[PDB]
């Protein structure tokens, strides 16, 4: 839905001397540069300064400053301008015009509330105020003040505790009254927010349905391979379940780049506009005759000629013959398939070689938006028995009518849901991956490895000695063992969107605490190239536009990312002797 966020950054000297204003500026920079890359027209931002030394306000109230008015859509240029404006204000008012003590920060909240009610008087827009204050137990908002404030605000408050220090016990008061009175109000420590904005951001791709049909075992091929309004339920001695297929494991492309041509600018700056790609066909006229001569004279010519796409036809290949098909045969050269999942049989998990799977994974789940809950029971029972007997099912899979025909393997998998109730209520679904055809198989015969023999088959020489070779390699494999890192439980590998959706597009430390301490899985690592280039772009914008730097200072990849892509160490071990006895030499 439509959302609006407002930021209040305390300028009082407690913030300024503690450098928490710099932390607030960095967090706002990250959040706004994140909002700018989407530039949604319904994403409002607005930043105020509370306990400010110099005040300029639209309602004529001192110690309240609107350093940035309401803005939508957020843009990179606007973000850079606002961030550098706030930095300039901080620089100018740091020492010579620094305030004293802690002023009345409640006054800022009232002005911000009035401005919010002016901008969003009755719209059903999620309004938000995210205040950064350095003192919670020091500021006093009395009972009348909090009552009037909670009467004025229908908006949620995200109060950030920028000042936290170690102690054997922590106690706070005062500010909790306003948070408690207003529903959906939250409190966080600022270091947690900085950690969250440091961590990589996972993709949130919406689940889009790919296939919708029936998972039928024993269905008649005459009533299922025909263009008919009704489905496979013309027979009453088969099994038929309506299911739909969603993506389950799809490869991610790198960060988007754009090819552009440099154009003019007011100050001869860099302005880049993306080019348009047009396809164009050409032929080569082979006129290349050269005149004879008694010297090096061999001049000739070779030029192409552009022709339209209308007078171009596909010449398919059959061995050594490139032929063009008549119009009628082109309609005949396509296999007319029909959507559906036709079960071929059930085989054990180890009876299907793992290298057979040849494409991206997909979900299979009972259709609930067009079918009945009887389908739900049937599908759940099938998945449960497949899991109990550890079975995989091979099926003839056609997603849509025009698509290819595939032989696919159905793997039963459970998926964990929080659900409205405390009971977790595992959800049963199949997982689909395609198996190769006769023409897909490229399996050849390779020379043997364990006990090498010559090409003719007689055994090869036993070299010098292999007794220590395997012992040293065994020690090597135990050195890097990662069995101490737990693997994600069976069911939590796939998490539903319901566990990841948030009502606000603001980076927060999140409430899903199950994902904590379950990232130890050495195989589930965040995408690293995409995050690397995203961080590089963020730092480029920061240094070269906000700090007005001159030379880029490319950051180091965080140790949190490097740890999962660098060698592991369980037991200390040196492989130098193994290298020496294995006779490894680069050629």
């Amino acid at each position: 839905s439509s959302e609006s966020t407002t930021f209040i950054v305390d300028v009082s000297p407690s913030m300024m001397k503690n450098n928490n204003v710099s932390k607030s500026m960095a967090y706002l920079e990250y959040t706004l540069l994140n909002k700018s890359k989407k530039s949604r027209k319904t994403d409002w931002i607005s930043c105020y300064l509370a306990n400010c030394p110099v005040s300029e306000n639209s309602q004529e109230i001192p110690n309240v400053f609107q350093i940035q008015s309401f803005l939508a859509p957020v843009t990179t240029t606007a973000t850079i301008g606002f961030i550098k404006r706030l930095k300039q204000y901080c620089d100018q008012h740091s020492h010579d015009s620094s305030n004293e003590g802690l002023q009345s920060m409640i006054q800022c909240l009232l002005v911000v509330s009035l401005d919010i009610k002016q901008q969003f008087q009755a719209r059903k827009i999620l309004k938000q105020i995210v205040v950064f204050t350095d003192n919670l137990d020091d500021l006093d908002i009395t009972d009348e003040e909090i009552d009037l404030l909670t009467e004025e605000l229908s908006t949620r408050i995200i109060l950030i505790d920028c000042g936290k220090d170690t102690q054997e016990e922590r106690k706070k008061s005062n500010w909790l009254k306003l948070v408690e009175a207003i529903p959906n109000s939250r409190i966080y420590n600022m270091n947690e927010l900085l950690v969250e904005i440091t961590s990589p951001a996972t993709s949130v791709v919406k689940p889009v349905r790919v296939f919708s049909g029936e998972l039928r075992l024993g269905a008649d091929i005459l009533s299922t391979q025909t263009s008919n309004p009704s489905g496979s339920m013309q027979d009453e001695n088969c099994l038929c379940i309506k299911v739909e297929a969603f993506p389950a494991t799809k490869a991610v492309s790198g960060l988007n780049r754009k090819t552009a041509v440099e154009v003019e600018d007011s100050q001869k700056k860099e302005r880049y506009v993306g080019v348009k790609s047009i396809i164009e066909y050409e032929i080569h006229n082979e006129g290349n005759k050269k005149n004879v001569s008694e010297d090096d004279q061999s001049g000739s010519s070779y030029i192409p000629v552009t022709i339209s796409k209308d007078s171009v036809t596909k010449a398919y290949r059959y061995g050594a013959d490139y032929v063009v098909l008549p119009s009628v045969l082109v309609d005949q050269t396509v296999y007319e398939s029909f959507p559906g999942l036709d079960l071929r049989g059930f085989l054990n998990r180890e009876a299907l070689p793992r290298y057979f799977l040849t494409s991206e994974s997909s979900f299979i789940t009972a259709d609930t938006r067009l079918g009945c809950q009887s389908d739900l029971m049937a599908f759940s029972a099938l998945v449960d028995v497949m899991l109990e007997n550890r079975k995989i099912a091979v099926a003839r899979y056609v997603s849509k009518k025009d698509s290819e025909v595939n032989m696919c393997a159905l793997c039963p998998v459970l998926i964990e849901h929080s659900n409205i109730n405390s009971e977790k209520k595992f959800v049963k679904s199949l997982t689909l991956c395609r198996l190769p055809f006769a023409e897909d198989e490229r399996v050849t015969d390779f020379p043997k490895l364990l006990d090498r023999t010559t090409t003719s088959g007689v055994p090869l020489k036993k070299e010098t000695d292999g007794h220590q070779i395997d012992e040293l390699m065994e020690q090597f494999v135990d050195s890097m063992d990662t069995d101490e890192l737990p693997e994600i439980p069976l069911g939590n590998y796939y998490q539903p969107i319901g566990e990841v959706t948030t009502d606000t597009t603001l980076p927060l430390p999140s409430l899903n605490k199950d994902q904590e301490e379950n990232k130890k899985d050495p195989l589930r690592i965040p995408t690293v190239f995409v995050y690397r280039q995203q961080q590089v772009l963020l730092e480029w914008i920061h240094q070269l536009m906000i700090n007005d730097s001159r030379e880029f200072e490319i950051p180091e990849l965080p140790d949190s990312l490097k740890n999962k892509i660098s060698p592991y160490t369980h037991k200390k071990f040196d492989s130098t002797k193994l290298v020496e006895v294995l006779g490894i030499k680069k050629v």
């Binding site: 439509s2 008087q121 009755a122 719209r123 059903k124 827009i125 919708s212 309004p229 396509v334 938006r369 067009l370 849509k400 025009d402």
Partner: protein
């Protein structure tokens, strides 16, 4: 397949031209996808909206009575003005008029007087003629008493009585569109926004020589999650027609 075979583009463009009153709808492209062997209603609508909307040029003549429109011989006339949509959007002036009408009706209900001047009258020996309209007399004006008539009236917390007669009279006197649209606009936007709030906002914006925005983002009702969406034109349907 997975293309649009320019003759197909011209066919769907002609079909859209035949019904200019359904160019931006969603059912028309579903019917086209039913008739066209390939492509779905969503795909056809996207194709027309992005690419073929630039080549519409003309629409075959369509009038209220009726569609299509031919000449004496029976030929098809092409016009360069597209008829309006079937869902008329609301504007600031319409909302202001509705707010004023509701405020005046509520004021009449309680104080038994209609702005600005006239007062209630009852027949004794001479009648005010037709009784369908208000039996009103302007003679006892201006009244010596002090009344909030009418800009000083505060209409908050008042939600009736209104009934069906008031909206029928509003649609007749204003000579505007259907009564259901006015009723839904009123109940879902003006009441949830505030009649006096919108009145003050409109008056203030008009005073400062600025155009006030009409009410927006005031759904106030759920989208009813848990049930199929009312209208789907994807590869699933593709409904069968006869």
């Amino acid at each position: 397949k997975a293309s649009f075979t320019d003759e197909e583009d011209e066919f769907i463009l002609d079909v859209v031209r035949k019904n200019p009153t359904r160019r931006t709808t969603h059912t028309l492209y579903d019917e086209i996808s039913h008739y066209v062997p390939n492509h779905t209603g969503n795909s056809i609508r996207h194709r027309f909206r992005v690419y073929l909307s630039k080549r519409l040029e003309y629409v075959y003549e369509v009038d209220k009575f009726g569609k299509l429109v031919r000449d004496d011989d029976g030929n098809l006339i092409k016009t360069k003005v597209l008829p309006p949509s079937i869902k008329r959007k609301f504007s600031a002036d319409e909302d202001y008029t509705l707010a004023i009408a509701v405020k005046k009706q509520f004021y009449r209900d309680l104080f038994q007087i209609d702005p600005d001047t006239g007062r209630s009258l009852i027949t004794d020996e001479d009648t005010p003629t037709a009784i369908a309209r208000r039996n009103m007399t302007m003679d006892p004006n201006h009244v010596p008493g002090s009344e909030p008539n009418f800009a000083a009236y505060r209409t908050q917390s008042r939600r009736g009585p209104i009934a069906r007669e008031f909206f029928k009279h509003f649609a007749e006197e204003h000579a505007a569109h259907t009564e259901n649209a006015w009723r839904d606009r009123f109940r879902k936007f003006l009441l949830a926004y505030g009649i006096d709030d919108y009145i003050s906002y409109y008056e203030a914006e008009k005073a400062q020589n600025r155009e006030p925005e009409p009410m927006k983002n005031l759904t106030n009702r759920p989208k009813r999650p848990g049930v199929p969406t009312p209208g789907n034109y994807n590869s699933a349907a593709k409904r069968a027609r006869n």
